[PDB]
Design a protein around this nucleic acid. Structure first.
Lengths: 65, 67
DNA sequence: TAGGATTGCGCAATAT
DNA sequence: AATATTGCGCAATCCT
């Protein structure tokens, strides 16, 4: 009986729960997408560092010639 | 009018559309989670390379400095 | 004006 | 008893 207050409070609470559950899942997914952007940027930064370090090593080694 | 045969057909088509769009987003999420695992293993490889080269360069510079 | 894609929400069965 | 999760569906809105 959807007319009983018992039903109403039940729907009211579950609607809050469903929206909360759905918000949490959407947050977890957005974070995941952000971790990709972040890792991507950090890997780019490290590759640049690898290249710089290699240039520094070549330059010092040329000092032997 | 929700009794219209036109209405029922429109609902059926949108229900198919909704499932397809949800499937697609769920797949996209799964692909994104995999990319994180992949980018993480690459990040570990790069960190190791940077550490290795950094030690190699520190050693070489120290040799030149001890002249 | 038509029609699929996207998304948030409600309901209720089901799970914890 | 109560919250959390989710399949199905309605509908508003976005996008072609």
């Amino acid at each position: 009986d959807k007319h009983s207050d018992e039903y109403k409070i039940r729907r009211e609470r579950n609607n809050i729960a469903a929206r909360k559950s759905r918000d949490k899942a959407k947050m977890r997914n957005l974070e995941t997408q952000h971790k990709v952007l972040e890792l991507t940027a950090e890997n780019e930064r490290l590759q640049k560092k690898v290249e710089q370090l290699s240039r520094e090593l070549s330059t010092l080694r040329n000092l032997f010639k």
